[PDB]
């Protein structure tokens, strides 16, 4: 469940970049390179943490089950994990 | 043509 599954999950039917954040803000580990991981998931993670800080200001630990932001050309999903948050770019259709 | 229709009705009688 590592090599063939890594290819199966990165270039999955819809998944553009499964850029898993490493320590909730600095995305390093991923199934691909570090620029697409760090830059994309870090800025989207920071700005999504600001929006979550607002929703968190409304109700604090009402976190997201799976924030499926179905953006037009490629969705942005935010699923908060323990050590990090999930900032993955995956197309809607 | 209200008065006209009334005139037509009176003319037909």
């Amino acid at each position: 469940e590592v090599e063939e599954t890594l290819k199966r999950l990165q270039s999955q039917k819809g998944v553009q970049g499964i850029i898993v954040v490493n320590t909730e803000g600095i995305p390093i580990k991923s199934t691909m390179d570090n620029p697409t991981t760090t830059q994309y998931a870090s800025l989207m993670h920071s700005f999504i943490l600001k929006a979550r800080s607002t929703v968190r200001d409304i109700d604090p630990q009402n976190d997201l089950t799976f924030l499926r932001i179905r953006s037009k050309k490629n969705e942005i999903m935010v699923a908060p994990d323990k050590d990090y948050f999930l900032i993955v770019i995956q197309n809607p259709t | 043509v209200f008065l006209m229709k009334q005139q037509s009705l009176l003319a037909k009688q």
Partner: protein, 401 residues
Amino acid sequence: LTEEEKQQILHSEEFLSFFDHSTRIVERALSEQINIFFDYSGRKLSLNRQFFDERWSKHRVVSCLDWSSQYPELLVASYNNNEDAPHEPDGVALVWNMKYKKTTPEYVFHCQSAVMSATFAKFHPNLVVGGTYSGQIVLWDNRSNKRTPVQRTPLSAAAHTHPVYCVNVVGTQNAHNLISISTDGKICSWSLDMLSHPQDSMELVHKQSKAVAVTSMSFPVGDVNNFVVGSEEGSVYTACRHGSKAGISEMFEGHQGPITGIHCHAAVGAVDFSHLFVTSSFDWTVKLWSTKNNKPLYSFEDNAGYVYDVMWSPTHPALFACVDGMGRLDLWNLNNDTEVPTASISVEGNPALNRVRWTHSGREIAVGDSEGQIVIYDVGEQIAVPRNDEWARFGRTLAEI
């Protein structure tokens, strides 16, 4: 420094609860992923230039607009036979000050009478000439600053015995002769220094007793020198200087009526020989011909009155500067639109487009309509680029088919 080890966490996978649960909700979201439903939803004359002024065209009429090469982009907004407003002597030309970016003229000059399509000369833009109303090509030096016509040539049989239609230059500076094809069916070309009488009386008719005229007989646009003497019933003669072809031998006619807009296609940018000698019909049409067509090669269309002048743009052999009968100067282009108005210059209402010419720079239209201002219609994109062969191609094709 953020982390150190990033191999066994993805290798040893006890964290599959969080990993596979995150990707599990991904796959749960992948059960539908419904995007947008069906629902039958689905998902030239732009203030270019002008020629009118209180001292140049104060309520006058620009029935003529030349394409003088010497000091180019100066449409000579002349004054034909009319009585609108008297300001200067008869035959007051107003060569547009487009070079200095002005809606006024750069060099205005009156004459002894109402001339017929005057033009420039060579080696200087001062000693211009043009077929006057007496019958000859009256010349005047702009460097001498003379209001009326400075020196008018003899208007006898050497010049036009009958009325005048158009005047222009002949060839490049090596053989630039003042050639004028008038309303007498003749291309009389005098020398650049010898214009005391039009010497080269190349009459595009025989030597009989008749006023075999030529309606608005201009030379070929793009300096193809074909002084097309266009008679009242087509017969756009290829009146040249001399020889056995300076007349109606290879007559590039085709105009249903008086072949008035007589000026061939310009220099071949991406076109063929481009000898498509135009002949605007008096039946509201403009039939072009060629050196090997002699019939309506590229017939333009219109629907009112008689056309007066037509000359191809010099930046594109296809693009032209022609007219129609409802104000919109139906500038045709044999490649893009050989019949309807491709570049329709929006003149004043239904202005009498009594003249249409095109300077050596091309990609525009220097025309003289009822509006005294020279209606400059910048064609723009019609410049020295490829795919222009369709002009001569459509000409020979329609002349076949």
